[PDB]
Chain A
Amino acid sequence: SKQPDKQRKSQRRAPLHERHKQVRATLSADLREEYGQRNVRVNAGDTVEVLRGDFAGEEGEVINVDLDKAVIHVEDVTLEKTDGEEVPRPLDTSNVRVTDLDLEDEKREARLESEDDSA
């Protein structure tokens, strides 16, 4: 499908497991070197650095990852509500870079390390 309508359609309608790819980000130099991948599906454990938004430059821990909306929550990247409350400002993993990994999962780390699969 070279057609814009179908392209957008397939992204917006991809089943749950096919959304993981929409929450991927580039990996710092060290990390690409260490595992042999250019980017990784951000996990709520990883640390990351904002490279584009108004929060570009800031670094923080990934607090949440939504697959439906293809967005993430990074600690301290927030907005001032009217009532004074502070809420997270959603980000696109495309403007983010993972500087640290949470590898408490054998499986993820298993995937990361192997050279025939990517995490």
Chain B
Amino acid sequence: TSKKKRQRGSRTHGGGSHKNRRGAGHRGGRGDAGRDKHEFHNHEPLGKSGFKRPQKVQEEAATIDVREIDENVTLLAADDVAEFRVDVRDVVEEADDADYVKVLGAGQVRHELTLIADDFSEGAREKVEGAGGSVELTDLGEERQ
């Protein structure tokens, strides 16, 4: 049995005094009315802040952490093996609608890895070289200067 089901007979249906569930006054105003007066409580403060840059001047980077690449190197049997060598672009999903691919250095790198992407973070590099590996910057990556 549901709560609604049990209301027949209660008269008030759980609203207390029958003088309650009337109009919007029982709500302190229609919609967000009073967000600054009576019900200012729990409403982010009023005003403007900052600015935005035109939507089409904005570049969206497709990112991935070493840990993800590394945790599945073996499993990526359909990807070069050497002295492994993986081009990130082919790994990351959404790597099409993205203005470029960027490797981030979160986690561990337990294999010697040869990584090819458009951009890397310090941590990703250090980590990938520290495991006897190399990071190769794509031709698009040739945008550092």
A and B touch in the complex (CB under 8 A): no
On B, residues with C-beta under 8 Å from A are none
Interface residues of A (CB under 8 A from B): none
